[PDB]
Write a protein that binds this ligand. Structure first.
Ligand SMILES: *C(=N)N(Cc1ccccc1)N(C)C(=O)[C@H](Cc1ccccc1)NC(=O)[C@@H](NC(=O)[C@H](CC)NC(=O)OCc1ccccc1)C(C)(C)C
Ligand SMILES: *C(=N)N(Cc1ccccc1)N(C)C(=O)[C@H](Cc1ccccc1)NC(=O)[C@@H](NC(=O)[C@H](CC)NC(=O)OCc1ccccc1)C(C)(C)C
Ligand SMILES: [Cl-]
Lengths: 300, 300
């Protein structure tokens, strides 16, 4: 029994974290095969960030300006190129611990584990969701840029996130491993704000299913609803629309519990329109939305 | 910025997990140097658990009855000793991935990371607190016994917990790595109940300080309280008594923020007496008590 916000084991990713230094800036890089990936703003001073032309700033850099250390060992940079907002530093040595891996771009609402790092040293591991506004509510202190997020499937590590920046509101933004930012953010010092965040409806439902599976059933009811009627209510409470693809992804949990997705949707409607009235679900007083359907199945 | 439930990186511990089988029972063992540690009830059938005589059951055991597998490879057992409720299996090969390590017995209120494991295979990592009633609220599914809890300090793993059992209430119980149970529990199928759980007041306070540091400060107020007056209220809501040693532990966070500990105790008193009135702190609707003062300092 038991249900916790659970991160993937981080060993495979710990073996890939390295330290990258350009001038006074030190941050983290990801060492896979003979390439080290890191944020391209590693080449910028704080003053360059006002209006940087990364193409120019990178033309003025030599491989010997990039200091890469894997633990105590220095790694010789022998080439460099920029892909969107990520710098690719080719090194003379292939990471002998490179796991089987992929680069994937996740959709809002998807979860991943984050290996927080400082000057190449892993500090902690926690679970995150890509918010619908393409921010993440993480814990990234100074020297954490280049920390990565990932999921693991059958010994294969799917890297999905690299940390680049923090807004004045304290929320975090970054890129996939091809350098494309999630959300409307840019790696320069200009005005940018995250849109209004919403609740990940399909994840709340998956979590309610986790509650049932774990014996918490007080919120269940006999009632059913239609998808349109549910989303009309969902709209009002700042929930993301529930699509028929969501209903399909929830099918396996519906089967395990014998509760139709639309039966559970009526339970959720009632919680939105009446609150909880002092009770809790899985020990939470709010509806949790950072568990995907797949997270629940993996842990139930 | 940001504050999150954070586990230590699990790599060093993953390299220690093995599978231990005695008859039909399979669970997890911890492989350090040439010794494997596991719960001694690995030697019990479902029938033995009623009133088990561990000493008698082990007199009929040979080293070749214990099958240990590290990945795809078998590890030859060449000896055994029982220390309290932990079985120690001497093996012919020293784990080449043995980290620097120590065995420590934690106190209630302290936190540690748990590497949940299944048949020697890591499944996930999460952060736990030893409850004041010497239970833990984890996620331990089939094949989870022998999973360990730990802290990491300067490349050294301090193992503090090994998972043995789950009470009827769904809470979890275990031992230190010398086999001494936390709390009044025993490894036999007998009626067992956990004492009354209380809220870890000093941890709730450290978490309120984590909130302030991160800009979440709506709950602050001008008012102060005495330690005795605070504890009169706290007791009513099933909080642990706050001692002067607790107040002293909060000192560094008090200094960082300029909020005297007893001023924060009056903010907490008001939250207990009036609720949150719909707001949240660090995104939680309930007061969080599984962050120690040291945990907050590490992440802030
Ligand atoms: C990565 N290792 N770091 C260092 C760091 C991490 C955590 C806390 C402090 C420092 N970071 C996050 C960076 O190097 C990035 C680089 C960057 C700068 C600007 C735009 C994009 C990337 N720094 C930041 O994320 C900074 N954020 C900002 O400067 C934001 C960006 C919109 N603007 C901002 O805060 O403007 C007001 C302001 C106030 C005070 C100082 C500077 C700017 C940072 C979080 C470091 C302020
Ligand atoms: C460890 N690898 N496992 C396997 C497992 C993990 C999770 C879920 C199912 C199986 N576990 C936890 C064990 O082997 C231990 C061994 C044990 C048994 C009895 C006392 C001490 C250790 N099993 C348990 O923890 C079981 N717990 C109990 O039997 C508790 C002990 C007080 N009593 C109990 O549950 O009484 C009601 C009851 C209900 C159903 C069957 C038997 C008894 C377990 C959680 C597996 C029931
Ligand atoms: Cl909550």
């Amino acid at each position: 029994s038991g249900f916790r916000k659970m991160a993937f084991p981080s060993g495979k990713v710990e073996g890939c974290m390295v330290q990258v230094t350009c001038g006074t800036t030190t941050l983290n890089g990801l060492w896979l095969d003979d390439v080290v990936y890191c944020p391209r703003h590693v080449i910028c001073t704080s003053e360059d960030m006002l209006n940087p032309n990364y193409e120019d700033l990178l033309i003025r850099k030599s491989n010997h300006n990039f200091l890469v250390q894997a633990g105590n060992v220095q790694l010789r940079v022998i080439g460099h190129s920029m892909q969107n907002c990520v710098l690719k530093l080719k090194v003379d040595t292939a990471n002998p611990k490179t796991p089987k891996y992929k680069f994937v771009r996740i959709q809002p609402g998807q979860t991943f584990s984050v290996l927080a790092c400082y000057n190449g040293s892993p500090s902690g591991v926690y679970q995150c969701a890509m918010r619908p506004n393409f921010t993440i509510k993480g814990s990234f202190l100074n020297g954490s840029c280049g920390s990565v997020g990932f999921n693991i499937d059958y010994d294969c590590v799917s890297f999905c996130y690299m940390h680049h920046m923090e807004l004045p509101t304290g929320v975090h933004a970054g890129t996939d491993l091809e350098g494309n930012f999630y959300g409307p953010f840019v790696d320069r010092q200009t005005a940018q704000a995250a849109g209004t965040d919403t609740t990940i409806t399909v994840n709340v439902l998956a979590w309610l299913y986790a509650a049932v599976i774990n014996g918490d059933r007080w919120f269940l009811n006999r009632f059913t609803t239609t998808l349109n009627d549910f989303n009309l209510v969902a709209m009002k409470y700042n929930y993301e629309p529930l699509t028929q693809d969501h209903v399909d992804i929830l099918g396996p949990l519906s089967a395990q519990t014998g509760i139709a997705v639309l039966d559970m949707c009526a339970s959720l409607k009632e919680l939105l329109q009446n609150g909880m009235n002092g009770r809790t679900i899985l020990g939470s007083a709010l509806l949790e939305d950072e568990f995907t359907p797949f997270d629940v199945v993996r842990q139930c």
